[PDB]
Amino acid sequence: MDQENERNISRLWRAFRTVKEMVKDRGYFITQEEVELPLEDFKAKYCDSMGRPQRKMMSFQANPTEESISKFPDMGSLWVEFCDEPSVGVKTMKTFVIHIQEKNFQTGIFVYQNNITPSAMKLVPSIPPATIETFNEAALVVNITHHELVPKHIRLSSDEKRELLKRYRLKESQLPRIQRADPVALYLGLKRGEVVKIIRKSETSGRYASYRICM
């Protein structure tokens, strides 16, 4: 009983850390202090005296003006909201969508627990131009970017993509393609037509740069 609660608390803390790391990597403003939040502090703050995990971890991330706003002058605020229900419902996702629309958040990240309802998935792509992204706690327990087999992925802006296409004299279709359902694409929140930059290490040259288009 108690060991299951402790394991769930540890998994939730790891998922929260991974979510914070993903938000920081996407370009928003997250301090390095909150990223390595200790387990004891997490239990003290986000967990009540009884011990049940309370999914009150709601954060609003703002795009920094130092580099994020300068590179992409179209990023607003992010709203990541964990869900207390084990299996989410159509009505609850409707309230979540209304909550997102009320304060006109550009994008919102929703994390469920076990499974997602196809009825809610049908309305997931609604309410444009706001984008709603769904994630699983089990998939977010560990971070895939930190893996040694996953190279660094850097998003490219519209001007950078145009300059690359002009310099290399290529069309949009004449580039390597990455699926929109790829785990790295979901981690970075890539959209259709977005070009990402991959930096790897080879045994023939010290550094190698490759470009892929989300198609």
Binding site: A139, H146, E148, L149, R177, Q179, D182, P183, V184, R200
Partner: protein, 256 residues
């Protein structure tokens, strides 16, 4: 395992609890369907003492598993844990009685309170249920490997470390198991890597597999050829097999 507990034998022994221990199939020996109209008393005197000390509430049909002494070996004995897992996988009125894990043989009894339906519940409790571990995993082998790590003086030295090899491939939840290193896990099956890591990681794993196959006999092949092959086969977002259904299903020329 974790870099800190690299040579720790006790940490390695604690690890390998993720192997799928099947329910009452690799641990039990025989199953009994002893009939007893009395919900409290029993016909045989083997467990009368445990019934006495333990004590819609009548179970005419009774279950009994002979188990084996191998429960203490390999995996933990945990006589109470097995019954607790059975209860949390059944709940309802599946009242069960534990053993005292000291009266020689280990006996676990199950009773159902409301014989054809008994066979169905026995089949469910025997075939499709798990106690502890990771599914789709059968055999896990622990062995010691030598890894080159620079010394504090600045020289590469050979440091032995424990490495676990698993027959199954369930990397989706294996990587989330605490106590292991998730940034160094590897799988020879590149099919499952991309669905959890990405296309680039899948390409790297495919190149590693191709290099291992080529270098098995001892021949040497330049890196450029294998790199070109793996880049061509993974130009799109997924694998493009060199078959009729793979590269021959693209937008190239009709004649070619």
């Amino acid at each position: 395992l974790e870099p800190g507990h690299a040579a720790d034998q006790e940490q390695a022994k604690l690890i390998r609890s993720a192997i799928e221990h099947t329910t009452l199939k690799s641990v039990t020996i025989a199953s009994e369907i002893y009939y007893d109209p009395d919900p409290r008393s029993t016909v045989i005197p083997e467990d009368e003492e445990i019934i006495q000390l333990h004590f819609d509430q009548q179970s005419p049909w009774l279950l009994r598993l002979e188990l084996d002494r191998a429960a203490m070996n390999d995996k933990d004995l945990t006589m109470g844990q097995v019954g607790e897992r059975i209860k949390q996988t059944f709940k309802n009125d599946l009242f069960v009685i534990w053993s005292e894990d000291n009266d020689e043989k280990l006996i676990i009894r199950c009773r159902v309170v409301r014989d054809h339906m008994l066979k169905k519940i026995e089949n469910t409790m025997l075939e499709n249920i798990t106690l502890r571990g990771v599914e789709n995993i059968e055999r896990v082998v622990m062995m010691k490997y030598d890894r080159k790590v620079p010394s504090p003086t600045g020289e590469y030295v050979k440091e032995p470390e424990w490495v676990l090899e698993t027959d199954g491939v369930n990397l989706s939840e294996v990587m989330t198991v605490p106590g292991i290193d998730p940034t160094r896990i590897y799988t020879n099956s590149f099919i499952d890597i991309m669905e959890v890591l990405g296309i680039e990681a899948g390409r790297a794993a495919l190149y590693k597999e191709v290099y291992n196959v080529i270098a098995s006999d001892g021949s040497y092949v330049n890196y450029r050829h294998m790199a070109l092959l793996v880049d061509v086969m993974t130009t799109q977002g997924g694998l493009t097999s060199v078959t009729r259904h793979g590269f021959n299903r693209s937008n190239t020329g009709a004649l070619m």
